[PDB]
Design a protein around this ligand. Sequence first.
Ligand SMILES: [Hg+2]
Ligand SMILES: [Zn+2]
Length: 258
Amino acid sequence: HHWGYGKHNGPEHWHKDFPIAKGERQSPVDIDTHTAKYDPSLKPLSVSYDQATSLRILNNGHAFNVEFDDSQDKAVLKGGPLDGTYRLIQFHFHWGSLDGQGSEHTVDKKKYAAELHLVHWNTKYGDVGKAVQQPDGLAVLGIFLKVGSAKPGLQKVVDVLDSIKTKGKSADFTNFDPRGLLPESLDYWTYPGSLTTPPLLECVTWIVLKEPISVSSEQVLKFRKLNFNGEGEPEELMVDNWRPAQPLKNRQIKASFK
Ligand SMILES: [Hg+2]
Ligand SMILES: [Zn+2]
């Protein structure tokens, strides 16, 4: 039936409905810091989120998305390995049932507690639907979360999770500033890949930040109280909504730092 993260419809089953799963540029991957090549020609990332307009937060089964108004160049990503402007459309997380797992990408096989994905689409294509059909349609900024001290800027997200506990629930979520979720350094690794959930389209330029952000045990705990199921259906905690590392194949991970 519908894909998920359970025993019978998890990541290992996705290929049956989405053949691209066994594709050539699938994500996530393991970042081997000793094999990633420092590329001196990579420009600094340019993150312009000062005019960001969040609109809503919703539980879509699978995860929770904070959506932004992408009708204009309000919140954009440029620079780095990117050509052109990419507008922020939404951000979501992937997390585990325990602090030792949850991230999708791994660094030298190390898994983090969770991973934040800020999804942007190339403005050249007019809309996200067209953008997904292109090799350079999307740019996703990945940030690792480790358990330690609380991240103040993440609390507004944490406090609203109660109202979107089950699949299909949404809540107005205005005036949230995404700049509060950024680490202080913007050093990164980049490689060409895909969406990590079906349809698993190979249209993503991945930008994974080296420096993780810290969140408290209590903050991550609230993520774990969400449900994959809808209201009235039997309860299945939304945990371990991450896809394991895929083979790198013919790809090279470049690093912006030496
Ligand atoms: Hg594509
Ligand atoms: Zn994601």
